[PDB]
Amino acid sequence: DKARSRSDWGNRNVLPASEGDAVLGRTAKGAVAVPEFGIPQLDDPVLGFGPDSMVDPRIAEADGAVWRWDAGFVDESMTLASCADISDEAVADEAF
Amino acid sequence: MLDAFAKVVAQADARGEFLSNTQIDALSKMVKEGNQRLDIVNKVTSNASAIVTNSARALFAEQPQLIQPGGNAYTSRRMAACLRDMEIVLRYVSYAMIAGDSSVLDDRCLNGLRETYQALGTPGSSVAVAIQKMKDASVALANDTTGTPIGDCSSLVAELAGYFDRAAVSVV
Amino acid sequence: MLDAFAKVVAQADARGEFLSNTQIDALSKMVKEGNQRLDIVNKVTSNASAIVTNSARALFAEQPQLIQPGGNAYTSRRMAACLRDMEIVLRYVSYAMIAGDSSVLDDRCLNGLRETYQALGTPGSSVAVAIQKMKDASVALANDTTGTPIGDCSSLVAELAGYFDRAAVSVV
Amino acid sequence: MLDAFAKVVAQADARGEFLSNTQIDALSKMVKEGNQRLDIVNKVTSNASAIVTNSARALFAEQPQLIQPGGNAYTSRRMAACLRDMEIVLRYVSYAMIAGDSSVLDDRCLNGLRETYQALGTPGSSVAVAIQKMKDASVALANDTTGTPIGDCSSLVAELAGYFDRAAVSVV
Amino acid sequence: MLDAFAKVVAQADARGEFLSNTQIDALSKMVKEGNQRLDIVNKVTSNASAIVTNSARALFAEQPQLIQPGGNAYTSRRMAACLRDMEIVLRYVSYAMIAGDSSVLDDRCLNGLRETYQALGTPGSSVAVAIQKMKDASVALANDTTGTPIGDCSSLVAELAGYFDRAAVSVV
Amino acid sequence: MLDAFAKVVAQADARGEFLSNTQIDALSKMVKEGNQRLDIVNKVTSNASAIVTNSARALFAEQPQLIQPGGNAYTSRRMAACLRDMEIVLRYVSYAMIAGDSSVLDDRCLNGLRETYQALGTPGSSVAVAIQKMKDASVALANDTTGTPIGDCSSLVAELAGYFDRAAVSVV
Amino acid sequence: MLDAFSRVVVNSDAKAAYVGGSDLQALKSFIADGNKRLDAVNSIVSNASCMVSDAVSGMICENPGLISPGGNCYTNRRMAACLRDGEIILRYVSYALLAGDASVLEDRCLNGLKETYIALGVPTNSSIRAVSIMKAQAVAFITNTATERKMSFAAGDCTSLASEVASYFDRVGAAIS
Amino acid sequence: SIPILKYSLSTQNQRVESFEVNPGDEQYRIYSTDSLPSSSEVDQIIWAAYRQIFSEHQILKSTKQPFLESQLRFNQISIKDFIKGLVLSAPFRDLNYNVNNNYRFVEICVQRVLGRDIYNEREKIAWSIIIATQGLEGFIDTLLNTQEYLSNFGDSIVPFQRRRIIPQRSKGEMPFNLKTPRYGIEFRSKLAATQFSWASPIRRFRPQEQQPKAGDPALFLNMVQEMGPGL
Amino acid sequence: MKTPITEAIATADNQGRFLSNTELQAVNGRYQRATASLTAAKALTGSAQRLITGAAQAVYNKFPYTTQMPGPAYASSAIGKAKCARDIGYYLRMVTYCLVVGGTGPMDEYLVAGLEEINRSFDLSPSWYIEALQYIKNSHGLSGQVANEANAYIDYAINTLS
Ligand SMILES: *CC[C@H]1/C(=C/c2[nH]c(/C=C3N=C(/C=C4\NC(=O)C(CC)=C4C)C(C)=C\3CCC(=O)O)c(CCC(=O)O)c2C)NC(=O)[C@@H]1C
Ligand SMILES: *[C@@H](C)[C@H]1/C(=C/C2=NC(=C\c3[nH]c(C[C@H]4NC(=O)C(C=C)=C4C)c(C)c3CCC(=O)O)/C(CCC(=O)O)=C2C)NC(=O)[C@@H]1C
Ligand SMILES: *[C@H](C)[C@H]1/C(=C/C2=NC(=C\c3[nH]c(C[C@H]4NC(=O)C(C=C)=C4C)c(C)c3CCC(=O)O)/C(CCC(=O)O)=C2C)NC(=O)[C@@H]1C
Ligand SMILES: *[C@H](C)[C@H]1/C(=C/C2=NC(=C\c3[nH]c(C[C@H]4NC(=O)C(C=C)=C4C)c(C)c3CCC(=O)O)/C(CCC(=O)O)=C2C)NC(=O)[C@@H]1C
Ligand SMILES: *[C@H](C)[C@H]1/C(=C/C2=NC(=C\c3[nH]c(C[C@H]4NC(=O)C(C=C)=C4C)c(C)c3CCC(=O)O)/C(CCC(=O)O)=C2C)NC(=O)[C@@H]1C
Ligand SMILES: *[C@H](C)[C@H]1/C(=C/C2=NC(=C\c3[nH]c(C[C@H]4NC(=O)C(C=C)=C4C)c(C)c3CCC(=O)O)/C(CCC(=O)O)=C2C)NC(=O)[C@@H]1C
Ligand SMILES: *[C@H](C)[C@H]1/C(=C/C2=NC(=C\c3[nH]c(C[C@H]4NC(=O)C(C=C)=C4C)c(C)c3CCC(=O)O)/C(CCC(=O)O)=C2C)NC(=O)[C@@H]1C
Ligand SMILES: *[C@H](C)[C@H]1/C(=C/c2[nH]c(/C=C3N=C(/C=C4\NC(=O)C(CC)=C4C)C(C)=C\3CCC(=O)O)c(CCC(=O)O)c2C)NC(=O)[C@@H]1C
Ligand SMILES: *[C@H](C)[C@H]1/C(=C/c2[nH]c(/C=C3N=C(/C=C4\NC(=O)C(CC)=C4C)C(C)=C\3CCC(=O)O)c(CCC(=O)O)c2C)NC(=O)[C@@H]1C
Ligand SMILES: *[C@H](C)[C@H]1/C(=C/c2[nH]c(/C=C3N=C(/C=C4\NC(=O)C(CC)=C4C)C(C)=C\3CCC(=O)O)c(CCC(=O)O)c2C)NC(=O)[C@@H]1C
Ligand SMILES: *[C@H](C)[C@H]1/C(=C/c2[nH]c(/C=C3N=C(/C=C4\NC(=O)C(CC)=C4C)C(C)=C\3CCC(=O)O)c(CCC(=O)O)c2C)NC(=O)[C@@H]1C
Ligand SMILES: C=CC1=C(C)[C@@H](Cc2[nH]c(/C=C3N=C(/C=C4\NC(=O)[C@H](C)[C@H]4CC)C(C)=C\3CCC(=O)O)c(CCC(=O)O)c2C)NC1=O
């Protein structure tokens, strides 16, 4: 049944699966929720963070999405990116 | 390692941003919980040998094969190393509770533990039952009101029990 | 490690044979161009800091997202490690130019470097661009006659350009 | 490591049993022929240098491609390492003869040795020929009647022959 | 190493006594001096590169034999060690300021420093001059009321000056 | 370290001599007391905890200043070092009983033990009466016939009491 | 060796400077409060014998294991040495209070005392407690707040002389620690 | 005289400089007798050396060497002799050396004495013949007398896992006690009192791991414990 | 990260221990200081562009050769002035990160480690950045314990460059 008491955190329920199912005012991991976005310093097309800036590897390590026991841990084997491009001539020639 | 205030700094630097007033105001909501977070790790540290041995006693009453001759906790050395494992996991969940997030637990304790137990022949699904029995011994202790002023610390109880859940799905 | 002369002996020992007359005369050809080979490595190590700091400055103007926030050469330490690895690669290339073969460059500079860069998230195709920028900054300087007697040493420059190409293709 | 006596104990502890009376009586039969077991490793140890150097000499007479150029036993360092591999294996067979079982032979000599010779490029079938050449050389010494009272040791000699045979199939 | 609170505890255990109320009330006076003590330590640690560099530059002005060719401070490696030795002593004096007693200045800095300088040929009297020039450079800074509440803290600057005299008579 | 056998051998190599027949006889006499010697060492080893813990309890009862606060055995760090020292003396005496001469006791236990306790502040005359109590507790315990065939065993407990007397004089 | 005036001169001779007027204001108040210093030494020396027999008796009543057989005040030869080990501390402090500088107890008393005491086996934590009691008796005579003896002075304040002598006793404890 | 055979290096973190002035929380706590520690702080050097050579699970009372500890407290042996004395100790030979072969014992002692991983597989092959021909006492002396030991740790520092975390990251390389346990996949089988090699998660009819939904009244329990004073 | 929280965890984990009151007091001292230390980060962020364009102009006043001399290392072009005000904002942003964390964590990882090797290679003189930090140290306008917190990280940056 539902989670009702403080005693249920140690006996019956484990952890919310999404941010909508989380405790009011906190994340799905139990921490306080921060507004996720700050003030961009140094607006500039060539310098400064932009749409073509690369993704720091320490953003997935900070939120813990690099451990296989994490909710947001991505497995890259069964995705559409792992599929062979059928518009390549060496793929349609080998498969034909 | 990261604490909960250094996680938001690392998310903001990987984008070259300042911190807005909405983000600062959410970090001073984390400071105001500061004395209730310190009471929770004090109740876990002060009762730390009754968390471990009451929940190991419970583990062999309902799985008595682990201490029968031929089991994994059968000898005095493998019994002592079994209680060492539970004090180790309880140590790092206690570290992740003052830090505010589980990164010191993730790479110093849980990183490579599931693969360690497979090379030893230790039942990793029974280590998860050991962590789950320390989970509610520690939660029933943190809901206990003795020695504390009056007020609300129920979002912190739900947070402490989530580090015990992360430690228990990482070992099965 | 092996140099060029010790590489020839290693072929001849495995067949259990004395060296021939043509293998002796091929070795006395490498002795004859010894002063032109020593003159190249002197030209490269004397400008070794300028090869690195100008080939880096051309890389961050060509690929400007490497110094933007989130880029792989963004912080003081990530910027100083890029200039470190270019100096390491250029150092072992200078070692392989006096030896005569790439045995020291393969063994103690390049072994496992591709897998090191994949694990860090460092773009290995960008490291290859910066090595090729160091290649023609060194080849253009090795072809400069200011201080040397006039003559043709273009076979040695085509050998130095192959050590840079070897390190460029075994890093991505 | 275990001897023949602690092999029975470690098997009995995993069942939680005392030793049965037919297990004590099978152990006291080992003590009855204990003097003849010691006379076997007295003959093998006292001629251990001649077992290695006579069977190595016969290995290269019949496998003359090991010591030709390019062969695995061609250099001074590669040939002296072939001699000490035979002296290592002959040493760990005699450790398995006074112990009674092949637990020191398997754990300390033969574990992971087939994969080591595959990484080195050593022909593992020829190492088995050298072990079999040491087998009959020390069986011929074990059946010598000089300096002993005449009796039947034929079950002990057939056990020493099984230790060399186990070493020869564990290496190819 | 000890602080001032454990100095009075190591002396009460050696006679098996509880601390009397006078020793407790003398310790609680040290606690309410605590914010003024952290101001002095903050005032030194934030000017630390200018305490060292100015009192060095004032030392080779009045003693030009130190940096003249042949002097103890003449070369870059010996000039770098004279600046390290000034920074080390100022570091361990500020360590003994937050502690309240000089047990950390004594063992891990000053024990064996007259013996070390006599082994190398460093003029130990010139080192005492440089320590007394960092003393009145930082006694003058702790008497500065910029950004502090104006109260009285003359008893802790007489304490901080005593740790500089302790290090200056210990090298001569 | 030497036993009674290799002591006589080592005194003959210095002269370059064989062993005389009157020394093979005196070495064969102590072989015939072999079983009587092993019974003494087995008695002292089997009561090793009760020899020490009774002699220590009888030591602090007559010298109560060793444990009252500020004494040399007042703290559990120092008190466990005192009990450790008493069973180092007992352990090295029974090594000398097995060998036959005090060379292992004289070298790696007694040489420098007087200078060690002087340099620490330990009263060496109190370690003497801690050794004298273990002598009378273990020559009375090697003089009872429970378990041993009654012959005569008095020439060897005069030797065992001679090793305790050697240890009690080299602590002052 | 070096009093309050010799301390000024050796710090001006380091700079080869003349002792002018801005550095003579610490020495014009040394003399202006000169009768109070002589009134402060007189309150220590006049009852120094009682100050020692109370300090080492007060050390023994707190640590009664010093006079047990094996303690460091056991014999009559050991207790007589302790009764002057702590009478020579009070003597060199009253030289330092008289001269206004610590360069006589740190050069004739405190130098190498910690090596001397652990060569003999003297417990230093009890030697500091004997000195600590004498420091409490010293400030109770500079200020006229002794319980069993009041002395006859003029009216005023000596809290700078009371804290100077309490800083001379603290470097004795900092030397054997 | 049979020199060691040549192996190739590999790229590692410790072969290359970190720029790292003012280190942080992942700096790994030099334990040295060059800082003149007292009795309470030489206990911490001893526990750190037990943790490094043994596991944390082998710091039992029956494992501790009380006489090797007292020769370190009297300045008779250095920390390099304490580390050598723990490897040649009787508990280390019984619990670690007897349940490994010669190739996995080299990589335990490289990871724990030198503080770095092996370069390649041939480095295990190169050192495992120092054990088989000279013993453990000869192998640990030629490993402590390399220039890799005397430059990093010297003779008065406890070893540590050198350069485990890159300075920007929060997740670093695996710790060497979790990466290499006491025995491995060989000796596991039945040679170390084991069975069945895996286990499914424990089933139960009271589920114990239910996920709270979006309308569950335990996600609002704050303020349920306590309200304002009343004004 | 040189937070007071992660220094307490690392202190307990060095000796394999639970967190006693030795380490909970270090965490508690962070929370008592976090009030003044978070109003400083809010006020420095709100005056960011005022302090950045002001401190850039103070470097061009004291060092006017940096706007005249040709070469890539100087602010004598439109790109050299964009990269100069980029670097003032880098030093300002790391100060505010240290104020929301407590302790000199972000400045050591992101700014100080490797800075000496960068300033030698690209010929960037560290006296320019000292002058830029001395401007912000005098012009942020804060007072009390809020300026006392802010200046402790401006001064920590000056000691690394000096
Ligand atoms: C009741 C517990 C279960 C159990 C445990 C058990 N574990 C071991 C052995 C090891 N445990 C670890 C784990 C860690 N090491 C670390 O450093 C950390 C983080 C700080 C963790 C979590 C390791 C590395 C080992 C093996 C190394 C060693 O023991 O030296 C053992 C003993 C194995 C043996 O036989 O030697 C036991 C018995 N076993 C059970 O049955 C319970 C379910
Ligand atoms: C002397 C202090 C004792 C005592 C000693 C005697 N023992 C005699 C014979 C004996 N002792 C042993 C045990 C010994 N041998 C071993 O192999 C081991 C350990 C594995 C031990 C402890 C054996 C086996 C024997 C029998 C051999 C023999 O007969 O010599 C003995 C001889 C009898 C006599 O002549 O009196 C003596 C004196 N006996 C004592 O009464 C005191 C207390
Ligand atoms: C929550 C699960 C508990 C509970 C917690 C509360 N604690 C409150 C105040 C408080 N707690 C401490 C101790 C803590 N601070 C430290 O510095 C250290 C270490 C030395 C520890 C263990 C102190 C000192 C204080 C006083 C702070 C104050 O006076 O405000 C508290 C007060 C309410 C509030 O702060 O808003 C609560 C609710 N109380 C409970 O009922 C549950 C069981
Ligand atoms: C080809 C890439 C160059 C070039 C090379 C030549 N160098 C010649 C002679 C020469 N070079 C050196 C420099 C070098 N040799 C050393 O021993 C040392 C350091 C100790 C260094 C740095 C020396 C000393 C000599 C003198 C020997 C001689 O005169 O031959 C040279 C002459 C002919 C030849 O050696 O075959 C050539 C062609 N010259 C060029 O035009 C390009 C730029
Ligand atoms: C078996 C391959 C031999 C053989 C062996 C026999 N030896 C017998 C007794 C015996 N064996 C030894 C050698 C060994 N025992 C030791 O204690 C030591 C050194 C510590 C060694 C090297 C000795 C000294 C003895 C004498 C003891 C005794 O006489 O029992 C033996 C039993 C004697 C018998 O049957 O009469 C046998 C059968 N005999 C053979 O024919 C093959 C060649
Ligand atoms: C002494 C030589 C100085 C001086 C010291 C004073 N500080 C006074 C109060 C005070 N100081 C601080 C800052 C300090 N506390 C911290 O926790 C930290 C670091 C995080 C620091 C730097 C605070 C917060 C306070 C207020 C609390 C209190 O009142 O104790 C103070 C009291 C005023 C007076 O009575 O004069 C003094 C004397 N002030 C000086 O004038 C000299 C230069
Ligand atoms: C009583 C307060 C102590 C204590 C005192 C003992 N001191 C002993 C010997 C001793 N003390 C000194 C230092 C003394 N001589 C000086 O010149 C100065 C300063 C100018 C001082 C403080 C020395 C040099 C000696 C050596 C022996 C001697 O010459 O008399 C001592 C040893 C007596 C003995 O061993 O027979 C004692 C007992 N010891 C205590 O336990 C309390 C705490
Ligand atoms: C610079 C042009 C490119 C770049 C470089 C970059 N590399 C690293 C990190 C490492 N580089 C090494 C390299 C070596 N180690 C060796 O032992 C040898 C010789 C055998 C080499 C060449 C290693 C081990 C590391 C990781 C450890 C460390 O960083 O010290 C970084 C590190 C920062 C990061 O998080 O990646 C950087 C920035 N990156 C680029 O973007 C350029 C294309
Ligand atoms: C000789 C009969 C055959 C032969 C031998 C040969 N061996 C090697 C090299 C090694 N052999 C070992 C063997 C062991 N290591 C162990 O730890 C144990 C017990 C578990 C054994 C039995 C090892 C480690 C090596 C490598 C050591 C080294 O490289 O020096 C070689 C290699 C020589 C070389 O330089 O590569 C040779 C030639 N090979 C033959 O041809 C004979 C059939
Ligand atoms: C500078 C004002 C004066 C000066 C200094 C000087 N010192 C050295 C050399 C050493 N100093 C030490 C001291 C320490 N090392 C430590 O690790 C610690 C902390 C415990 C201390 C206190 C040591 C060991 C040396 C020798 C090692 C080294 O060379 O670095 C030198 C160099 C002497 C030389 O010849 O190498 C100098 C120049 N000298 C002066 O003239 C100034 C008065
Ligand atoms: C402005 C005050 C002065 C100035 C600036 C200037 N800087 C550069 C180049 C660089 N500056 C940095 C500094 C950092 N990078 C970082 O990631 C961090 C921490 C977050 C810092 C402090 C670096 C790495 C470079 C080189 C790469 C880049 O372009 O950013 C230049 C260009 C120099 C060149 O050769 O390209 C200039 C002009 N110079 C002045 O004259 C002003 C006085
Ligand atoms: C076990 C036995 C025992 C004692 C003997 C006393 C000893 C004693 N007296 C004082 C404390 C003092 N002792 C004196 C000494 C004297 N006052 C005079 O009038 C005389 C001239 C002189 C004694 C002959 C003075 C002046 C003080 C401080 C003021 C006072 O307490 O009277 C202190 C200080 C407390 C401290 O800081 O440690 C102690 C331990 N207490 C004890 O427990």
DSSP string covering H31-80, please? -BSTT---HHHHHHHHHHHHHHHS-STT--TTT--HHHHHHHTTTSS-HH
Q: Do H169 and A17 touch (CB under 8 A)?
A: no
Query: What is Dmax (Cα atoms) for chain B?
Result: 63
Neighbouring chains to B with at least 3 Cβ pairs closer than 8 Å: A, C, D, H, I
Per the CB < 8 A criterion, the answer to whether H56 and H175 are in contact is no
Shortest-distance ligand to the CA of residue F155:
2
Size of interface C-D (CB pairs under 8 A): 11
Determine the Cα–Cα distance for residues C108 and H120; give it in Å rounded to an integer.
Answer: 12
- Alpha-carbon span G74 to G78, nearest angstrom: 6
The closest alpha carbon to A33, from A25, A45, A42, belongs to A25
Tell me how far apart the alpha carbons of residues C78 and C84 are, in angstroms, rounded to a whole number.
10
Q: How far apart are CA H22 and CA I7, in angstroms?
A: 14
CA–CA–CA angle E125, E126, E127 (5° rounding): 90
Which positions 70-109 of F are in contact with G (Cβ < 8 Å)?
70-71
Residue nearest to ligand 1 atom 7, measured at CA: B82
Strand partners, B18: A39
Q: How many CB atoms within 10 Å of residue B59?
A: 22
Our answer on whether B and D touch (3+ beta-carbon pairs < 8 Å) is yes
Residue D69 region by backbone torsions, left for phi larger than 0, else alpha for psi between -120 and 50, else beta:
beta
Chain I nearest C-alpha distance from A61 (Å): 14
- Cβ-defined contact of I41 to B19 (cutoff 8 Å): yes
Nearest to E63 by CA among E76, E72, E51, E50: E72
Q: How far apart are CA I100 and CA I89, in angstroms?
A: 17
Rounded Cα gap, residues H105 and H183, in angstroms: 9
Residue E50 and residue I162: Cβ atoms within 8 Å? yes
DSSP single-letter state for residue A8:
G
Residue C169 to residues C106, C132, C158, C164, H120, Cα–Cα distance (Å): 12, 10, 17, 9, 22
Distance CA D161, CA D40 (A): 12
Q: What is the C-alpha to C-alpha distance for residues E2 and G115, in angstroms, rounded to an integer?
A: 19
Q: Which residues of B touch H181 (CB under 8 A)?
A: 116, 119-120
Cα B73 to Cα B83: distance, rounded to the nearest angstrom: 10
Strand partners, A13: H210
Q: Where are the beta strands (DSSP E) in I25-158?
A: none
Task: Using alpha carbons only, give the angle A6, A11, A13 rounded to the nearest 5 degrees.
Answer: 75
**Which of F77, F88, F116 faces H39 most closely, judged by CB atoms?**
F77
Assess whether chains A and F touch, using the rule of 3 or more C-beta pairs within 8 angstroms: no
Which ranges of chain H would DSSP assign to H, the alpha helix?
Answer: 39-53, 66-72, 79-87, 90-92, 102-109, 121-134, 136-144, 147-152, 176-179
- Residues A91, A79: Cα–Cα separation, whole Å: 18
**Distances in whole angstroms, Cα of residue D121 to Cα of each of D72, D129, H3, H133, I126:** 8, 17, 19, 21, 58
For residue I133, give the nearest of I104, I101, I162, I113 by alpha carbon: I162
- Measure the CA–CA gap between A37 and B12, rounded to whole angstroms: 8
At position A46, the amino acid (one-letter code) is V
- Rounded CA-CA distance H62/G12 in Å is 66
Rounded CA-CA distance I116/H21 in Å is 10
**Can you read off the two tokens belonging to residue D77?**
């360092």
Whether residue C92 contacts residue H183, with contact meaning beta carbons closer than 8 Å, is answered with no
Of I141, B158, C93, the residue nearest H221 (C-alpha): B158
Sequence-ordered list of residues with C-beta below 8 angstroms from that of H64, at least 6 positions apart, any chain? H50
Q: How far apart are CA H96 and CA F70, in angstroms?
A: 43
Residue I127 backbone dihedrals phi, psi, to 5 degrees: -75, -20
Give dist(CA B16, CA I140) in Å, integer: 21
**Cross-strand bridge partners of residue A40:** B17
For ligand 4, residues with CB inside 6 Å are C 33, 35-36, 38-40, 42, 142-143, 145, 148-151, 153, 156
Identify the structural domains of chain G with CATH numbers, from first to last.
1-177 (1.10.490.20)
Say how many C-beta atoms besides its own lie within 10 A of residue B23's C-beta: 21
Q: What tokens appear for B100 in the block?
A: 């505010």
Q: Which two tokens stand for residue C48?
A: 């070794």
For residue E108, give the DSSP letter.
I
Q: List own/partner pairs for B138-145 with CB under 8 A and 24 or more apart.
A: B138/A10, B138/B44, B138/B51, B138/B90, B138/B93, B138/B164, B139/A6, B139/A7, B139/A9, B139/A10, B139/A11, B140/A7, B140/A10, B141/B43, B141/B44, B141/B47, B141/B51, B142/B40, B142/B43, B142/B44, B143/A6, B143/A7, B144/B43
For a mutational test of ligand 2's pocket, the pick from F148, F150, F152, i.e. the residue with the most ligand atoms closer than 8 A to its C-beta, is: F148
Report the nearest-CA residue for atom 38 of ligand 6.
E151
Measured from the Cα of I88, ligand 11's closest atom is 2
Tokens of residue E122, six digits:
């460093």
User: What is the Cα–Cα distance from H58 to H61, expressed in whole angstroms?
Assistant: 9
3-class DSSP state of F102: coil
Residue of D nearest to C14 (CA): D70
Would you call H228 exposed, middle or buried from its count of C-beta atoms within 10 A (0-12, 13-18, 19+)?
exposed
Cα of E156 vs centre of ligand 6, distance in Å, is 12
Coil, strand, or helix at residue A32? strand
CB contact residues (below 8 A), chain I span 73-132, against chain C: 109-115, 117-118, 121-122
Centre a 10 Å sphere on the Cβ of residue G150 and count the other Cβ atoms it contains: 10
Count of all residues that appear for chain I in the document: 162
CB atoms within 10 A of CB C67: 20
Partners of B150 on chain H (C-beta within 8 Å) are 226
E48, E33, E53: which is closest to E158 by C-alpha? E33
Structure tokens at E119: 């082994």
Give whole-number Cα distances, C80 to A53, C15, C108, I84, in Å.
20, 48, 21, 19
The atom number, within ligand 3, closest to the CA of B43 reads 22
Query: A6 to chain C nearest CA, in Å?
Result: 41
3-state helix, strand, coil in chain C (%, to 5): 75, 0, 25
Which residues of G fall within a CB distance of 8 Å from F68? Answer: 65, 68
Q: Which residues contact D139 (CB under 8 A, 6 or more apart)?
A: D157, D160, D161
The span from the CA of G162 to the CA of G170, in Å, is 13
Calculate how far, in angstroms, residue E84's C-alpha sits from the geometric centre of ligand 10. Answer: 8
Q: How far is the CA of D170 from the centre of ligand 12 (A)?
A: 87
What residues in C contact B14, CB-CB < 8 Å? 69-70
Taking CA atoms, I62 is separated from H119, I76, I86, I122, I146, in Å, by 53, 15, 19, 21, 29
Cβ distance A10 to B139 less than 8 Å, yes or no, reads yes
Q: How far is the C-alpha of H120 from the C-alpha of C21, rounded, in Å?
A: 40
Adjacent-strand bridge partners of B17: A40
In angstroms, the CA G161 to CA G100 distance is 10
Give, using CA atoms, the residue closest to atom 30 of ligand 10.
E81
Give which of I97, I113, I108 is closest to C77, Cα–Cα. Answer: I113
Tokens representing residue I83 in the block? 């990269």
State if residue G99 touches ligand 12 by the CB under 6 angstroms criterion: no
Q: What does each C-alpha distance from B119 to F46, F62, H109, H190 come to in angstroms?
A: 40, 57, 19, 12
Helix H or strand E encompassing G56: helix G48-62
User: Which amino acid type is present at position I86?
Assistant: R
Residues in chain F: 172
Reduced to 3 states (helix: H, G, I; strand: E, B; else coil), residue E101 is coil
Q: In Å, what is the CA distance from H9 to each residue of B69, B101, C104, H163?
A: 47, 38, 10, 17
How far apart are the C-alpha atoms of F128 and F110, rounded to whole Å? 12
CA–CA distance, F40 with H4 (Å, rounded to integer): 50
Of E98, E99, E96, E100, the C-alpha closest to E170 is E96
Strands B17-18 and A39-40: antiparallel
**F87 known ligand binder:** yes
Q: How far apart are CA I75 and CA G170, in angstroms?
A: 59
Q: What is the DSSP string of C111-159?
A: TTHHHHHHHHT--HHHHHHHHHHHHHHHHHHHT--TTS-S---HHHHHH
Helix (H, G, I), strand (E, B) or coil at E35: helix
Which residues share a beta bridge with A39?
B18
CB-CB under 8 Å, I110 with B28: no
Which residues approach ligand 3 with their CB closer than 6 A?
B 35-36, 38-40, 42, 142, 145, 148-151, 153, 156; I 21, 24-25, 28
What is the rounded distance in angstroms from the CA atom of residue C34 to the CA atom of residue C50?
A: 25
Rounded CA Rg of chain D: 18
Q: Cα separation of E102 and D117, whole Å? A: 62
CA distances from H84 to B115, H1, H4, H95, H142 (A): 30, 25, 21, 16, 11
